[model samples]
Target: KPKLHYFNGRGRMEPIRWLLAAAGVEFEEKFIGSAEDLGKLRNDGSLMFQQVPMVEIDGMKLVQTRAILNYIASKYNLYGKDIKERALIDMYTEGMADLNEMILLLPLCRPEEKDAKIALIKEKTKSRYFPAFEKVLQSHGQDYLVGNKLSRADISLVELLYYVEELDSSLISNFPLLKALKTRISNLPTVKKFLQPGSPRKPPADAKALEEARKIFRF
Candidate 1:
């Protein structure tokens, strides 16, 4: 049996939860409330090293969230069927992570600085991060980010588009390909069923703080 111990917040771990649910993998869950819980678990060897995205499988622990998601997806037949397809899917997933990092950065500054901070993000989004991603989506012709199928890559990109919209709806509107890609993914039965305005397997608390801080700082 495989067991996943995690905080309720969604960061790197979110894709894993979605993957696990989609793959029909049954695993135990332990949610930690604070950094202290994590520290104690790490110090006592009760927790694994490096991060929160660790999985215990047959008593062997696996770290690294993306690595674990890939492993699980492959094991459960969720990974792409061909080598090139798999590679493309992975590329999409990596791109999603880069965007997610920016979203994660939004809440750490003073409240008055949010506009400037968001402006910075808006500027960054126009570069390789969003435009290249927009091109990738266009390349797929409004299909999945890669493999043109419902792989982890598709799920990741869909979630990423949502993140962008949360920051500002105009973000996706700027790129028609991205907008079409998001629309297509949104139509997936499972994805449509699971998505809601404010519910996502527990987004990082700090993320909300950052958004609020941005507002406070007038950025």
Candidate 2:
């Protein structure tokens, strides 16, 4: 069985886990919760480039989240149908990562500056990112992100979109297609089962933070 090492939270690993579950690929999860644990892995040279979301399978180690997602997606024939489809999948998947990176900037900002950064991110997401994604969904004219079938791209979108929603529930409320796509992916039998409460993958502790954080932007 494959062993995935990452933090216990959803973070970057959630899509990979969701893909495995969706494909019925049985795997073991190992979580690292502290700097020391990560440092130990780096010190031992177990983690190439010293990052979470590393996967071990068949005596092979894979790093880089996008590469790992592509590897598993291709292995399971979920990447796409052909070259063009695969490219489209890759395009959207990378785009989602770009959006995720933008959202991540808020947390890295100093506490005193987070309110301004958060407000900017929300505006940018609303004005640019979310509409672009909504356009992709509308173009596809289906539940999935590409090729009228479930692909890794859809899984990536679901995870990132869910992350954004956790930050602010109203962020994507107006994007009906995106909301529907999120619901579709979350409702997949295996994915749904894996996401149920009591799973090792726990929600972030400060569940109320988003609401409080939004207050800082209120004018």
Candidate 3:
């Protein structure tokens, strides 16, 4: 089994969770609830560069978010089948990263700035990532992206779609393809288990939780 060490919040770890669950892999997580907890990994050198999105499996503790998810995808054969296929998946993943990144920090906004930030995110959504992704689905006309089956691109996209929906449930209303894409991906047998009431899929980071993370990470 793979074990992940990270703050109990979503942050970069949530997408890794999504990919693991999407791959039908069962894993456990060790949360850093305090600075001491994070320092333990650092002092022990179990983590590379003192990061939380670390995955321990097969005698190796891997850092680097992309590497962790990439390894898991390859292990479960959720990555693309060929070089070209993998490239497209990477391209799509990178394309979505910008919007995913902004929303990832959405919880970081001060209460006063929250609406403005989401407005910007919504603006970007309409002008950029969503449309491109919708086009990807349209061009292939397949249930999944990259290889016509579930891949990291699809996994991350769906994960991001959930976060974006929190900003505005109807945000994807104009993009029929991505809305349909979300339904299809969320209903996957294994992934469906993740979307249930209780799973390691952490909720959106609130102010108090974010502060706890700030302390631990700053340490």
lDDT scores in order: 0.69, 0.76, 0.86
Which model scores highest in TM-score? Answer: 3
How displaced is residue 207 in candidate 2, in Å? 11
Please give, for residues 33-147, the per-residue lDDT of candidate 3 as tens digits.
8889988899999988877689998788999988888888888898899999999998888878878888888777788998999899999998898889998889979988877
Candidate number with greatest lDDT: 3
lDDT of 2: 0.76
What TM-score would each prediction reach against the true structure?
Answer: 0.77, 0.83, 0.95
**Per-prediction count of colliding residue pairs?**
12, 0, 0
Clash count in backbone of candidate 2: 0
lDDT ranking from best candidate downward? 3, 2, 1
What is the Cα-based lDDT of residue 24 in candidate 1? 51
lDDT of 1 by residue, 44-137 (tens): 6754554667788755678888778878888877678999888877776777787788777665667898889888777777666678877876
**What is the C-alpha local distance difference test score of candidate 1?**
0.69
Please give the distance, in angstroms, between residue 155's alpha carbon in candidate 2 and its true position after superposition: 1.0
Among all windows of 10 consecutive residues in model 1, the one with the lowest summed lDDT is: 210-219
